[PDB]
Amino acid sequence: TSPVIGTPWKKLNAPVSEEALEGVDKYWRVANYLSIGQIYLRSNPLMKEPFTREDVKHRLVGHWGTTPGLNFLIGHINRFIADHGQNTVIIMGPGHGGPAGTSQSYLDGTYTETFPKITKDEAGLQKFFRQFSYPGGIPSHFAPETPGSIHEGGELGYALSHAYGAIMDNPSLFVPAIVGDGEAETGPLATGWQSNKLVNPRTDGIVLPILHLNGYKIANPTILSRISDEELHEFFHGMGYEPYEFVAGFDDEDHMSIHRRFAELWETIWDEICDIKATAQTDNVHRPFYPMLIFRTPKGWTCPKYIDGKKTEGSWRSHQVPLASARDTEAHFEVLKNWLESYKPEELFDANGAVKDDVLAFMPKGELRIGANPNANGGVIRNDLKLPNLEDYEVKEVAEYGHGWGQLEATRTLGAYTRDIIKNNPRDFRIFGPDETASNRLQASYEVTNKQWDAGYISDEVDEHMHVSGQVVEQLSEHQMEGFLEAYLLTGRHGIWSSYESFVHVIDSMLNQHAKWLEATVREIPWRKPIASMNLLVSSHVWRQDHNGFSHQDPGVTSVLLNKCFHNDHVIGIYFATDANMLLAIAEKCYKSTNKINAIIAGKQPAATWLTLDEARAELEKGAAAWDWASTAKNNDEAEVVLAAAGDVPTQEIMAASDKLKELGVKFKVVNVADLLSLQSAKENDEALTDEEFADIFTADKPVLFAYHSYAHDVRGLIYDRPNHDNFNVHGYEEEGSTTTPYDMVRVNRIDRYELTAEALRMIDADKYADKIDELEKFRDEAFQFAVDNGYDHPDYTDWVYSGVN
Amino acid sequence: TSPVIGTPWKKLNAPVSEEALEGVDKYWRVANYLSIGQIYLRSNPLMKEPFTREDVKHRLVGHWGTTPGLNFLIGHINRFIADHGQNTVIIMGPGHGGPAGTSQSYLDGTYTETFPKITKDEAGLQKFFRQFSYPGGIPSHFAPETPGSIHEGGELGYALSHAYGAIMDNPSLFVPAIVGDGEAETGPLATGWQSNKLVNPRTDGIVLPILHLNGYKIANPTILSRISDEELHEFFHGMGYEPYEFVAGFDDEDHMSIHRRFAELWETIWDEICDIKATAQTDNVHRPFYPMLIFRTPKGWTCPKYIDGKKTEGSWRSHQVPLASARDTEAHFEVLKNWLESYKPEELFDANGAVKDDVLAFMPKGELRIGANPNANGGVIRNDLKLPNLEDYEVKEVAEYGHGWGQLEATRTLGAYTRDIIKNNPRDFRIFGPDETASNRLQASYEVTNKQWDAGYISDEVDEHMHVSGQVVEQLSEHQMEGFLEAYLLTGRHGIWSSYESFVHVIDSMLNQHAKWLEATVREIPWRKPIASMNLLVSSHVWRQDHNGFSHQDPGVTSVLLNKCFHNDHVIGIYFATDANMLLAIAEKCYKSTNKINAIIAGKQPAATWLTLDEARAELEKGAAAWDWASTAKNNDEAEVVLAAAGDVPTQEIMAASDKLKELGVKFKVVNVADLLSLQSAKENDEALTDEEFADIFTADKPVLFAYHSYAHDVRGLIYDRPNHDNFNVHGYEEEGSTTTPYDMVRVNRIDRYELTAEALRMIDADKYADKIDELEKFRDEAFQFAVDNGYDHPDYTDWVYSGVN
Ligand SMILES: Cc1ncc(C[n+]2csc(CCOP(=O)(O)OP(=O)(O)O)c2C)c(N)n1
Ligand SMILES: Cc1ncc(C[n+]2csc(CCOP(=O)(O)OP(=O)(O)O)c2C)c(N)n1
Ligand SMILES: [Mg+2]
Ligand SMILES: [Mg+2]
């Protein structure tokens, strides 16, 4: 559960003290000095003479155009957290301002705790300076290695979705979400503005969006900064916000005059937020206007105004590095030396090199710190889900009526299971879906919870299962759902989210980024505890898009997921639910797991059930298993072909083809691969099937016919070094489809039962079976003409039931 | 060039006639009847008795929740185009309202022209009804097979970007962009609202956004419909629009009263647009507020109000199909019969079954029609680029100083070439980039054009190369850039767009969709003429992300591009520019091509040049070629290894390793693969290298060491059936990186020169070369410790120049 920390939502009821703002100004100066020492210096952190070009880095990498503004905001937020005792997580949208975050971690004392070799003295300062963006050092962005970070910020557009996710079901947590003005042009964040219509001020926390409007992107100005102030305020008010505006640094006003002004504006905003929270305890049915801060400052605000006669401060020329070579001229080194001395570090550091005590007296202590806040490290919060007994949801008719029974929909079983998980776990488990929960048949959870909706209600003929609080969030944006769930998991909670297969590509970037958060975490960051897994139910898949057609058919999610399987990280799982029982086993395993991205590919269509629960779990631990009840060959020597399958429709076609093969006396084996990554190379993947086990499943000399859900490229690229891999003949999706009957969909991809039987016959003896092969091939065309003439699939195809049903 | 059609931007200066609105109402009724006959009927289109359940489709697929609103808007737009003679292309954002578009194509006469077997009589109406969403029929969405369509609309969020792209450099074209209210929640379209700050009213056309606010998504209401009207107008005004609002169908007002009211509102909006256009001829430096229409209607507006006691009209229950089974009960069939008779088709069709003449008298004729407009079929507009002589831009120093000369940046050559293409082709070629044109070194085009920017200007110390008109558009959104370019090509123009490699994933969906527009076009749609290719310069690639690090390294674009290579469509090209000359040849070939997606992967870093222009073109036509100047073995028999490469950094490492191999007497071959898809299976890909050519390039028995830009999975999945494929040892990206020196980046991926030399030595004789292998392995660690100690890469690595430089 999310803990209550400090004294939440308290008003100051006093002026901001002068001593605190003294401390805030000194903090800002020292944070800018650290952020510059990191970029430029490799030695001599405190500029003991001789300070020469020997002390400067050979290759200057990093960013400065956002760092002083971030340091300003972070120092003021630190004063605020010390004063109010607020439970606060900062989300840094422009993550390229990494030196700001590392300077915070260093100054609040958490960096030395996490990394003991970076001491708080001259040698520790030298190591801290050298390690930024260095061989064998720390990254340039706001990284998982950086304490106090739940968001990398490298790939832009997801500060707001992550903020609204982090506050969900989390009522005491305050999140200032700093948003770059260039990042605000990206598609994800524009729609992430509208997510205050999906949170409740009573049951969820408060997100304060700080638009960091410094006017410029890389080498280009931002649209928001160059439209009129009337337009900007009108725009933010049309999205349910009260815009506040702060402008600074565009004239010669004294720094204290700026710190004081920001203190009054900040306390005004805090009082509006506290009023909203206090009102929500009585009335939470009508939405408030949350304050949001527009923070207009010059880009690179403390750097030299002009360098080489080019406007540097207040321009895009300060984005990455002013003084691109302070190492190769004497004039640029003098500019750099003057820039470092303009902060007066001589008074901010003591003799031994530690930041002076009066510079950090205004700082929060203990669990209130940014790097120490448990919501930033959501693995220490996390507790296991309390799971219902799986046998309660098993489809038992397979156990007595025989394999292949029924016309059930696989995802309804997961719906019931997830409903009871929600029942056992309220306020820790949440279901997201881009308008598609009821189309993936996960609506059984409406028996115990509602869709959280905080826009207007109009009627009850149209607004069923909607409520101002709920455990089902549903907005038509995959970016929103994925950012919500990722921030939900990163804070310590659990969740599933469902989607159409073809639109998972919309978040290929986001998944990639999350994998990079996991790949980095499992490799080099032990102090970050495991978080829950990102569970993605992929349904309404390529083979059954009757209503939509070719635009909704693209199973390429498997390929993008296969690219993140390296160095024994195991941060990826791709599971194929052949039926409801296998889906139960997969979902149980996935809900128990940690630090992974689990894509469970299950169909919503009426499909037969093949396994019992014990059989499903037994197939699960191996990933691939032989179906002894479907095989006609007792041992590996007898079979004239191995028929392997991965996916519900490929499984159905393999089984129907096996029925026809039985009538011709063909001895074959039947294999089902539930988990794709078990087929990976044994030396590469230590949790994949060993080579002996793989050869036992697939006969070394005998041909293997493989029917696969996605593109066959993904199977062939995975088994390349496996034994008997030359004989594998993968049949997968082949970018051929439309709106048409279900048999046609598999016909045009050469994955129907007739084509599979003909493929197996050709693997054995093309000459002996020539007449039967011809008969099958002309039957495919007759059965297509049947669907054209009559509008539905052939009775031979529709009515087929497996021979193993009693 | 974009043609001027009709009489653009003319005011009516008269009331809308009563006869025209009579026609508009009759059109709306007949369009609704056709849109229902398509979904529900397979026979008896005009309901001659006996009209029985025999006449209804077995499987009812399709959508209705948006179709009557679309028919309303389209009929009114048709009256408008007939009256004003406007050059108009409609972009249908909710593309699942396909029956509306097909009903338009049928009613304006273009459908019979394109498809002669769908006549305009009873049999033709029966075929038109049966073919919708049928085996062997037409798709459900607004498809390339549908005349008058440039946008599929299946995957949501790109109606607005496509509209603003279609009007760019196109001053007489009017685009009403119909936007679904659910689609408006998606991330892409939220930022596509802000694209009126990137178009000029003088040089570009006018986009009118029609928000089709029917209140509901699939099974969920929309955020925009449930916020206050004040908020909605404030929101649209903060984005530079004047909101107009129309509300209809929510009471018992007469249909004519609605058509009249809409006529008046539409002419008011048109007069504001015409005022904007006339003002722009004198003043185009200050941005106007373009009108946008908010079209509030009930979802499924003419369907039965209640079915099964559930609110159907004005609800989300009417999204796909009311009466999910009008075939399986008699009551539902009676509901359907009453629904069809409520339009009074008895007076809309004549005896022979044609739509009556007075129903379509108000319709536009000739080139003004939606299905006949040349901007919808942008292949008939298209003309070839006038290309500068390639030899003008060749890097000639390779020809005299020897291969491997220099430290040039490859993309600057493309910058100059593209600059001269822009010079020869203004107002037909355009450069897009998500804030990254100057970071990919394409800024040479600023010598002949400017960045188009129509927000505010503040200074000239920061606003260089910006102008209210230009051929370089640059917004920080990959969705925006890709939609702009796709609508630019679909209208008949040409373009390039550049991006970081890691963020191309942001548009994996969009590329997929465009490939589906091309796969469908090259297979079954001959009447659609070829459009220019989508040219994507992928730069700032994985191997040289010094400033950014792990968050900016993901070369997975190659994998998603490989999934669209089927059935000899050739709609995909993946090219690796090994140096500037190869880049010139690739870019020339790509600019000449049609109906393709060409990803050109080129580095912006200082890299050596290896080929002359003639050599580069000679490598180009084959895709892969042997470097005879780098090989030490004269024939295929002598070589003890083949070193193949694809990519500038892999090429550099192969060449440096070849230098070390030369010192040990190893006989080897050197191969460079410029085009990835030539390595594909010969039987699958008729334009790939034949099997004999492939075996000639790669020795059958000899091991092949392959250094590859992207993940090795993509190489292994492509050569699976090729000869000698067992001996291939692909070395690619392995998700291991950070901010560090360039040698470290290739060190941690086992793709550096030392590791490649050791790999080749192990392929030959591990025992004989054991000491040398050990020496190489410990040198890698020494050269990494050098970078850690000193901050830059080893002199042995940095200073290395190929031995072939004179
Ligand atoms: C989607 C995406 N496209 C491009 C980039 C490359 N990039 C890194 S930083 C940056 C500019 C930062 O813009 P803004 O939000 O205005 O930041 P600030 O002014 O704080 O530097 C860009 C385009 C990215 N990180 N993500
Ligand atoms: C990105 C994306 N996510 C999901 C879908 C699935 N989908 C198809 S139609 C639809 C609802 C249409 O919403 P809206 O724009 O409100 O349309 P309308 O009210 O006109 O039906 C959805 C979610 C999609 N096409 N694209
Ligand atoms: Mg900015
Ligand atoms: Mg809608």
Side-chain angles (χ1 to χ4, degrees), chain A residues 65-66 94 96 153-156 180-184 186 212 214 216-218 222 299 319, chain B residues 434-436 476 478 500 503 506 552:
Chain A
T66 185
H96 48 276
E155 190 276 331
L156 296 182
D181 55 348
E183 159 188 27
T186 58
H212 174 56
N214 53 18
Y216 305 96
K217 306 188 287 285
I218 304 170
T222 68
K299 187 153 188 163
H319 177 73
Chain B
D435 189 57
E436 293 179 353
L476 182 43
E478 304 69 55
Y500 279 24
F503 305 133
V506 168
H552 287 63

Side-chain angles (χ1 to χ4, degrees), chain A residues 98-131:
Chain A
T102 48
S103 308
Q104 181 65 41
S105 184
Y106 188 84
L107 284 168
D108 63 358
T110 59
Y111 208 92
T112 316
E113 284 153 18
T114 306
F115 308 95
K117 65 179 73 174
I118 305 298
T119 44
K120 294 179 276 186
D121 62 71
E122 190 276 331
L125 202 56
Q126 188 274 330
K127 286 177 137 210
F128 180 68
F129 282 173
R130 190 176 289 185
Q131 72 185 359

Side-chain angles (χ1 to χ4, degrees), chain A residues 165-219:
Chain A
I167 61 158
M168 261 182 204
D169 286 324
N170 197 355
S172 70
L173 177 80
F174 181 53
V175 167
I178 303 161
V179 170
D181 55 348
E183 159 188 27
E185 292 178 355
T186 58
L189 190 150
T191 193
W193 281 122
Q194 309 261 38
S195 304
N196 52 357
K197 266 76 78 178
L198 307 162
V199 292
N200 196 254
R202 167 147 80 70
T203 48
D204 308 326
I206 290 282
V207 163
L208 169 67
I210 301 165
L211 177 59
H212 174 56
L213 189 80
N214 53 18
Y216 305 96
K217 306 188 287 285
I218 304 170

